Design a protein around this nucleic acid. Structure first.
Ligand code: K
Ligand code: K
Ligand code: K
Ligand code: K
Ligand code: K
Ligand code: K
Ligand code: K
Ligand code: K
Ligand code: K
Ligand code: K
Ligand code: K
Ligand code: K
Ligand code: K
Ligand code: MG
Ligand code: MG
Ligand code: MG
Ligand code: MG
Ligand code: MG
Ligand code: MG
Ligand code: MG
Ligand code: MG
Ligand code: MG
Ligand code: MG
Ligand code: MG
Ligand code: MG
Ligand code: MG
Ligand code: MG
Ligand code: MG
Ligand code: MG
Ligand code: MG
Ligand code: MG
Ligand code: MG
Ligand code: MG
Ligand code: MG
Ligand code: MG
Ligand code: MG
Ligand code: MG
Ligand code: MG
Ligand code: MG
Ligand code: MG
Ligand code: MG
Ligand code: MG
Lengths: 115, 83, 144, 98, 100, 127, 202, 214, 12
RNA sequence: CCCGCACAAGCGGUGGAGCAUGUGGUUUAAUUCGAUGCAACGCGAAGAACCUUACCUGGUCUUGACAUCCACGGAAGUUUUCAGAGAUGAGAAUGUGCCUUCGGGAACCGUGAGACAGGUGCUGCAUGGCUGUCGUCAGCUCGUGUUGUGAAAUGUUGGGUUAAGUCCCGCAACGAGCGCAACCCUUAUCCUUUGUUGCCAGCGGUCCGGCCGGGAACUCAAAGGAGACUGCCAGUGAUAAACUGGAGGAAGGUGGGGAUGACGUCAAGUCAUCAUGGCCCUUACGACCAGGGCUACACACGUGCUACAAUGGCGCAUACAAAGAGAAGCGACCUCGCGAGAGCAAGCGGACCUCAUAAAGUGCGUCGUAGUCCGGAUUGGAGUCUGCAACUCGACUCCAUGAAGUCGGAAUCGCUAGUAAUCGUGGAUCAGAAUGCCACGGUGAAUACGUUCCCGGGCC
């Protein structure tokens, strides 16, 4: 239930429950479970304290949660500090990957701001 | 990005200009239009004046800039806000 | 139009009425999907075609309103409903009702709506009653 | 066996070119598996017909490439020499394979 | 199109033909898996030094009658406009108005 | 002796060989249940035999190409109908009255310039 | 409305192509460009020879001319000059054949060229048009239409004038409609001439 | 004769309310609100008409009846269905439709209706019958009538107006309800009874034959 | 940092 | 008085969300130019990294990048060095041909000169050509005749009828032309011919695969025919046109779809496809180059895509297409890679080979109504490929991330059947770069009482 400093849900199949961890998607969850030997459809409730400890070991092989959040923060900070084009896009809160800003770009810009 | 098998691109004209700048000393800003050139390790500590379309923007090359294109440090569009 | 179709019956029961019902249930030309829902619903509800008739009888409207503009004023005049349109509206209202329910499968939503329909309970039956309410509130404008 | 593939843009022209080949090849002693009509290619082209804008104003053109196969089974000296003295109508493309 | 623009294409086609084999050689080295890094690196640098107009990707197909750089059809070597003009005069063999 | 019929529907074409037998149906070297999953497709195939009451009195050897499930089922019905009329010419009227003798000539209408599909016009903005 | 090209719509119904060769994609655009250059050369070189039509087969060129004598020349000297130049354009051995146009008053291109010649020599446009119509109907046209458009008589406002006689059933696909165009380059600008000649059905 | 024409019923006119006041000279009286033609005027006037129809016949002049039996029985011409407006004044155009009637009479014999499409061959025959009813009795005329004989001047006012325009002597049976102007030789009588018309038709047919023969 | 990935990823 | 998805009856959308795309605006050195109610706004553009490119900044040229003419030089060419962002300057090595009247001319290169070249500069309100549009709406006219002092009228109106100025009948009109219809293409049935690269009924084999021998039946290919005419029948109608139903028939009343656009209208669109009168620039408004821009972003609008889930998502298994493209191309098999891909390398200028695996579907399992096993935006890291080159500004892959969104206010759009809806597939352009466009099949509805109303139109 407690892996990587988070409560993973007990009622869900293990492959879905592990995707509660920041840094673990569908592919890494399947990989974690294949390594630990746990079947992917088994609920976290069904698993035993020993099996949960083998998941904790397999999750610790990846960078997850706060270790991943600081890695991402630092990667963005680096760009901003460089003052490269991508950095400036991060500073201005605009699309970083060449998207149009004449329209759209609402995910980056947020809600519409009347004149 | 450029496929790793082909190596990092750099304009030959800039490569030779950097090599000559390194061997000579702490020389003047290197004027270039080669925005597409990758920043190599041996450019660290040089000032490259990179063309942005109208001016050569001085870019003091640091270790963090290595692997990036020079054009990344010379914005081409001026924008200060709409109102 | 200014100048005034063949339906193939359902395989399981040989009813053109149930073939029409599948067609009303069907989305995006996915008839096999719709057939499996209806047959699941009828089996659950159940004869299959008797229970469907009972459900239709309690949703079928005999009268409804039609908007009629006369002298620059638009009144809701009562009109009789034709045998075909009675079935058509009943089936449309059952499907609409079933879709709005918050049960699991459409199979279950539909079976419940058809079971409710036979009890004179569901929103399909409510819709018929609302159409009959509207036709009686405008009984004044009947043969205008 | 000599395979002769004829192509043309007109079917009446290709039918006459086949009709000449079968006649001359069969006049001489040759087994001729007669003109097999192979699938016509229809290459289509849509073009805007205005010089400017009016995107929905188009012409649709096609070139139909007609195609015929004639196999000359068990041929002779007189066969191939007769087939080198035909001036088949221009606009018919003859491709002889062996 | 302007006369100069037509002259640029001619110049691009000529240089492309004139350096075609040299470019093919260098690009073979660059992409070859079983070649030295130095050989690949020298080939990368040499390919730059050739005229940019020797690259075939620099060529823009233009209508052979007008020079129009848009609406080209490769079959005919003409723009949509000059195709239609030729088509209707019966100058394009086999080509007629299609309906189906 | 075997009686033949070609059947066609949409882009499907079916070759139907009928002979006296026990009600075996083979479609592309597979049973009717194997070939057609859908019960409507199976119904459509068996409709002409059910009409003329020769469901268990004939063996069908069927090949079918082109189109989809419904196309091919409809092609086969047309082919069975034509094979039945070769088998017995008195059946024409019954099969004709059922609507099985007609070659359903409805085809996909071509896409047209300026339309998204055959008829679907793009959306109009007045203002 | 805009009208379909009368020639184009009748290709392969009652009207032949003017280029009859086969090519695959490799040679098709090259053949079209060489054909264009051959017709361009011959149109200019035989501008005073009443050339109606230049049929190209692959190179074999047939020149339909109302004056076969002026094209051919003395002992076929002039046609031999053309044939050498056509061979140089096409880059293959050339034959030039010469078809006679017996009735140039019934040939749409020659009538159109006749009108535009007169317009460039400042003939009154109505006079040129009306005689073109008269002559065609005299020589047994089932009908003729002539349309002239532009700054007629050097007017500031351009306009289209047309005259028709007989039948010109342009929607009838089996109608033998001979259609062609010409431009008169005047001192006031381009006047366009269109001529339709109906020679009967089938 | 005054006797001949009484049995015929020439003397009976139209009803008195529907009369033309220009026919006041030629009306004797009024029995039962039916104007009675003065036969003392008629027979003198019908004879001077026949004198002239003899003369025009005797100059080999074509007499257009406006009936079929009488015109055919003296080798002259008739229009017995609706007079097409501009039959004489627009003869140049109308004659082109007679040329079309001639052609469909040949295409019967040559067999052309039994050559073309069945349903657009009977169509070409439907013209022949339509053109026959209109243009049949002037098929083999080939010009203008040198004189026009008319039954009812008012009913056939178009024919009479065309004849005046061109300068073609008009002879006509003018009832008590009809206008005499535009008729060179007025013949007062009855145009609406068959034994009166067939009498008039029979008597003009006499002088045509006799004029041409003599 | 960036010099290391450069010298590793690219073979000179 | 009629008609049309015009409304109504329906089904699915748009308007809300994210994203794509065009436009306005704003911004900018430049955000090149054009299209602007319907009939501009995924429009010219069938594809802007460079090129394209028309714009900007800077660097450059001046008879010129592109022609002809003249004189003088000199074969073309090829190879390579230095400087330069490149344009372009300087070189250096080398070649020394062909025509051979043995004269020299001619290629092709320079340099000088000035006739000129050049202009995507302006005017679409000077134009040609081409196009949109009312509208595939049923109209629009003429000759002759007649009527009216005349402008004009009649014909063309009227009674019926038609999808139709369609046809019949009447009629001062009689005829004719351009439109309507038909002729054209395609699709639905059949026949004949041919029978591979396509086909496999029967017949032998068989490795069980049309695989083989064979067969010419059938599918199919594509040439030639046949077929539908209100032809037949009944009733209705003016002894009419036609209408209504029936038979037979694959098809029935124009069978379905396409092409086909009358006289004209909007000084509609396009001088930037091209052409062209006039005007204007000519060491510049022409020409070459590198780099930038056309991709900007408080924002507004249009067109789309993807969603919001359970008629669904995911996993596994497993069916059934059509149409098309391909030689500097399509690229199998095999091997390597989680994958995009890579390596090796057949076959195929194609009914043969390749792209290429249809997807929705069906079966089984799982999720169990949650902002979720819905959604897939955004962003980080790592890659692949094309391409001199993907910083500005490519597509794709992998791992991670996991936004808005709970079916969208007023309003508004499309569609009458193999239609809508939904599902994949292909093509043009194209080195690469589609949610656009053009095309192809699969599955496959609902509804139409009716003509009051809204919109457009026709006749009196
Ligand atoms: K996660
Ligand atoms: K952008
Ligand atoms: K224009
Ligand atoms: K008139
Ligand atoms: K101009
Ligand atoms: K750029
Ligand atoms: K889109
Ligand atoms: K939208
Ligand atoms: K499921
Ligand atoms: K999710
Ligand atoms: K890029
Ligand atoms: K919406
Ligand atoms: K492409
Ligand atoms: Mg992922
Ligand atoms: Mg982009
Ligand atoms: Mg030019
Ligand atoms: Mg390109
Ligand atoms: Mg479709
Ligand atoms: Mg509605
Ligand atoms: Mg929206
Ligand atoms: Mg302009
Ligand atoms: Mg703009
Ligand atoms: Mg569009
Ligand atoms: Mg650019
Ligand atoms: Mg250099
Ligand atoms: Mg100019
Ligand atoms: Mg204009
Ligand atoms: Mg404008
Ligand atoms: Mg009118
Ligand atoms: Mg007409
Ligand atoms: Mg038509
Ligand atoms: Mg019937
Ligand atoms: Mg204007
Ligand atoms: Mg540039
Ligand atoms: Mg743009
Ligand atoms: Mg092919
Ligand atoms: Mg593909
Ligand atoms: Mg998901
Ligand atoms: Mg929900
Ligand atoms: Mg419709
Ligand atoms: Mg799609
Ligand atoms: Mg009308």
């Amino acid at each position: 239930a407690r892996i990587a400093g988070i409560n993973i849900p007990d009622h869900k199949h293990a492959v879905i429950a592990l995707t509660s961890i920041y840094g673990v998607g569908k592919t890494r969850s399947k990989a974690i479970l294949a390594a630990a030997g746990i079947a992917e459809d088994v609920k976290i409730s069904e698993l035993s304290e020993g099996q949960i400890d083998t998941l904790r070991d397999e999750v610790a092989k990846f960078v997850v949660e706060g270790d991943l959040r600081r890695e991402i923060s630092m990667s963005i900070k680096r760009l901003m500090d460089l003052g490269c084009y991508r950095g400036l896009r991060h500073r201005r809160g605009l699309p970083v990957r060449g998207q149009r800003t004449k329209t759209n770009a609402r995910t980056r810009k947020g809600p519409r701001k009347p004149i | 990005p450029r496929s790793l098998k082909k190596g990092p691109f750099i304009d030959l004209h800039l490569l030779k200009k950097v090599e000559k700048a390194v061997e000579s000393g702490d020389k003047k800003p290197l004027r270039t239009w080669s925005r597409r050139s990758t920043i190599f390790p041996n450019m660290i500590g040089l000032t490259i004046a990179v063309h942005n379309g109208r001016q050569h923007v001085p870019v003091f090359v640091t270790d963090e800039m290595v692997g990036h294109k020079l054009g990344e440090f010379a914005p081409t569009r001026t924008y200060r806000g709409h109102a | 139009p200014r100048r005034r179709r063949k339906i193939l019956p359902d395989p399981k029961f040989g009813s053109e009425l149930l073939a029409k019902f599948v067609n009303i249930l069907m989305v995006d030309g996915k008839k096999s999907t719709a057939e499996s829902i209806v047959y699941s619903a009828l089996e659950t509800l159940a004869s299959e075609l008797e229970a469907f008739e009972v459900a239709l009888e309690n949703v079928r409207p005999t009268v409804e309103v039609k908007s009629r503009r006369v002298g620059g004023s638009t009144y809701q005049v009562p009109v009789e409903v034709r045998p075909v349109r009675r079935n058509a509206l009943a089936m449309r209202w059952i499907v609409e009702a079933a879709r709005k329910r918050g049960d699991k499968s459409m199979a279950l939503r539909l079976a419940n709506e058809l079971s409710d329909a036979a009890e004179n309970k569901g929103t399909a039956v409510k819709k018929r009653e609302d159409v009959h309410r509207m036709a009686e509130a405008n009984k004044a404008f009947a043969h205008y | 066996r000599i395979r002769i593939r004829l192509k043309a843009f007109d079917h009446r022209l290709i039918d006459q070119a086949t009709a000449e080949i079968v006649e001359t090849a069969k006049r001489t002693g040759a087994q001729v598996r007669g003109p097999i009509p192979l699938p016509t290619r229809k290459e289509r082209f849509t073009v805007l017909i205005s010089p400017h804008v009016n995107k929905d104003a188009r012409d649709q053109y096609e070139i139909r490439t007609h195609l015929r196969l004639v196999d000359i089974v068990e041929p002779t000296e007189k066969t191939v020499d007769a087939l080198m003295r035909l001036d088949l109508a221009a606009g018919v493309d003859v491709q002889i394979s062996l | 199109a302007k006369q100069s623009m037509k002259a640029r294409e001619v110049k691009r086609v000529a240089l492309a033909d004139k350096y075609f084999a040299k470019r093919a050689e260098l690009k073979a080295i660059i992409s070859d898996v079983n070649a030295s890094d130095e050989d690949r690196w020298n080939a990368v640098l040499k390919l730059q030094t050739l005229p940019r107009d020797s690259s075939p990707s620099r060529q823009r197909n233009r209508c052979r009658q007008t020079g129009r750089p848009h609406g080209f059809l490769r079959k005919f070597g003409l723009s949509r406009i000059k195709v239609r003009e030729a088509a209707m005069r019966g100058e394009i063999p086999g080509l007629k108005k299609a309906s189906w | 002796n075997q009686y033949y019929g070609t059947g066609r529907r949409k882009s499907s074409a079916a070759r139907v060989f009928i002979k006296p037998g026990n009600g075996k149906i083979v479609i592309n070297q597979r049973s009717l249940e194997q070939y057609f999953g859908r019960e409507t497709a199976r119904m459509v195939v068996r409709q002409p035999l059910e009409l003329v009451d020769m469901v268990e009195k004939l063996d069908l050897y069927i090949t079918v190409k082109g189109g989809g499930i419904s196309g091919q089922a409809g092609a086969i019905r047309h082919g069975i109908t034509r094979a039945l009329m070769e088998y017995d010419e008195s059946l024409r009227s019954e099969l004709r009255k059922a609507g099985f003798v007609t070659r359903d000539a409805r085809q996909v209408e071509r896409k047209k310039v300026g339309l998204r599909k055959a008829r679907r016009r793009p959306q109009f903005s007045k203002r | 409305g805009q009208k379909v090209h009368p020639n184009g719509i009748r290709l392969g119904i009652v009207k032949p192509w003017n280029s009859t060769w086969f090519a695959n994609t490799k040679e098709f655009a090259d053949n079209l460009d060489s054909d264009f250059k051959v017709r361009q050369y011959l149109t200019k070189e035989l501008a005073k020879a009443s050339v109606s039509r230049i049929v190209i087969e692959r190179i074999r060129v047939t020149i339909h001319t109302a004056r076969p004598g002026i094209v051919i020349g003395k002992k076929g000297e002039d046609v031999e000059k053309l044939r050498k130049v056509v061979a140089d354009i096409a880059g293959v051995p050339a034959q030039i054949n010469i078809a006679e146009v017996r009735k140039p008053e019934l040939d749409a291109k020659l009538v159109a060229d006749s009108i535009t010649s007169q317009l460039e020599r400042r003939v009154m446009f109505r006079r040129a048009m009306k005689r073109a119509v008269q002559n065609a109907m005299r020589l047994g046209a089932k009908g003729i239409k002539v349309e002239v458009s532009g700054r007629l008589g050097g007017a500031e406002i351009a306009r289209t004038e047309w005259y028709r006689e007989g039948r010109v059933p342009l929607h009838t696909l089996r109608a033998d409609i001979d259609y062609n165009t010409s431009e008169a380059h005047t001192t006031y600008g381009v006047i366009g001439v269109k001529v339709w000649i109906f020679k009967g059905e089938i | 004769s005054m006797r001949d024409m009484l049995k015929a019923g020439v003397h009976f006119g139209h009803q008195t309310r529907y009369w033309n006041p220009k026919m006041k000279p030629f009306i004797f009286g009024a029995r039962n609100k039916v104007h009675i033609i003065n036969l003392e005027k008629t027979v003198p006037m019908f004879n001077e008409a026949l004198a002239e129809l003899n003369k025009i016949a005797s100059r080999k002049g074509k007499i257009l009846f406006v009936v079929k039996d009488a015109a055919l029985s003296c080798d002259q011409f008739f229009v017995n269905h609706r007079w097409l407006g501009g039959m004489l004044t627009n003869w140049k155009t109308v004659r082109q439709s007679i040329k079309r009637l001639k052609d469909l009479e040949t295409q019967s014999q040559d067999g052309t209706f039994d050559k073309l499409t069945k349903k657009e061959a009977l169509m070409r025959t439907r013209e022949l019958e339509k053109l026959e009813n209109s243009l049949g009795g002037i098929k083999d005329m080939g010009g203008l009538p040198d004189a026009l004989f008319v039954i009812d001047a008012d009913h056939e006012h178009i024919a009479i107006k065309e004849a005046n325009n061109l300068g073609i002597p008009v002879f006509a049976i003018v009832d008590t309800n009809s206008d005499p102007d535009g008729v060179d030789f007025v013949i007062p009588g009855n145009d609406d009874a068959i034994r009166a018309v067939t009498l008039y038709l029979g008597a003009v047919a006499a002088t045509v034959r006799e004029g041409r023969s003599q | 940092g960036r010099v290391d990935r450069f010298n590793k990823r690219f073979n000179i």
